[PDB]
Design a binder for this molecule. Structure first.
Ligand code: 8BE
Lengths: 194, 198
């Protein structure tokens, strides 16, 4: 059950589709970025069409919607990465084994400007920076802390009923950490410069 | 899409079901175990009915069946753990970030043994305060595999000029494999828990 906006893959399971500037889908993604990164130049935006990553993500979304007895489990967040990680992420998504002050998971920023720091979106030899727009199953979240290998329990009376994610700040979060494969789908890659 | 031989779970998402000696289901597991741990005795065998683990596992298996086109990608393997880990494995499965370094490391992931005897060592199936040892019987998506190396955080590429097209698992020896290591969530389904004693 692959999404409408996806374009035809001629019976293939993975492609990167460059968005046409000026069109509905490109503008939507551009505006999410420019909210905090308007001083940056966008070279291009690619839609990640990864059927396998999508199916595994969607199964986890349906599980979490049942578990939490609501939708509102999903947020659109940013992830800056070096150019040499881009192919792996395109194919395999986010892997916690590859500063973890709020725990040993994969980090995602509320604001593109946070992910646009050179420490995350490392400029390549040409000054090209890379940032993903990511669907993340943040679900029910709590404040994290160093050393977590999974999120904490909602009640230590029930040690295996866990929060879905952890944050820096529960009232006003600026980052989310997830600890399980297939809790994040890389949806768009932004290639840009300072 | 839950298997039809499972107990009705009454909209419950998780259940441990105690098997009866004399059932084929019990005897096949007991024989797979006593093959290499005839010196131990089984207290009980529980089938693990975890709907979410099952669904995510079967999705990964369908993907590996399509990707590798005509394979036996699945093996039935053993995993000894301590009693404190059993609640978490039962609900959430096998988490590489919780994994013990193995005495012979072929990568930083979750280890599964071909032989019950390996998993029966106190170093994995640690006796609890009552002398109970715990070992899972696990469907593991071993797929296409190679000899691993202590440094691995993911399985290696099949081809060094295409670094993202990976082996599915690694092993100690490709000709006589006696353990497997997997580096991803939902690549292992814990099907049965054997509680045993000396
Ligand atoms: C590892 O990568 C990141 C880490 C991020 O927070 C790391 C952090 C930890 C503790 C305090 C603060 Br303040 C920030 C945010 C975004 C990315 C990213 N790739 O976009």
């Amino acid at each position: 059950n692959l999404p409408e906006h996806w374009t035809d893959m001629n019976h293939q399971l993975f492609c990167m589709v460059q968005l046409e500037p000026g069109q509905s889908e490109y503008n939507t993604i551009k505006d999410k970025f420019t909210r905090t990164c308007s001083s940056y130049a966008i070279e291009k935006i690619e839609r990640i069409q990864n059927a396998f990553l999508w199916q595994s993500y969607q199964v986890k979304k349906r599980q979490m919607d049942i578990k939490n007895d609501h939708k509102n489990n999903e947020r659109l967040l940013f992830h800056g990465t070096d150019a040499d990680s881009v192919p792996y992420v395109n194919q395999h998504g986010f892997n916690r084994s590859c500063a973890v002050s709020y725990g040993k998971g994969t980090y995602f920023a509320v604001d593109a400007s946070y992910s646009a720091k050179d420490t995350y979106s490392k400029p390549d030899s040409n000054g090209r920076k890379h940032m993903y727009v990511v669907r993340v199953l943040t679900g029910v979240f709590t404040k994290g802390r160093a050393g977590l290998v999974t999120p904490p329990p909602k009640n230590p009376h029930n040690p295996t009923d866990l929060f879905d994610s952890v944050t820096n700040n529960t009232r006003s979060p600026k980052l989310f950490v997830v600890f399980f494969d297939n809790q994040a789908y890389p949806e768009y890659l932004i290639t840009f410069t300072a």
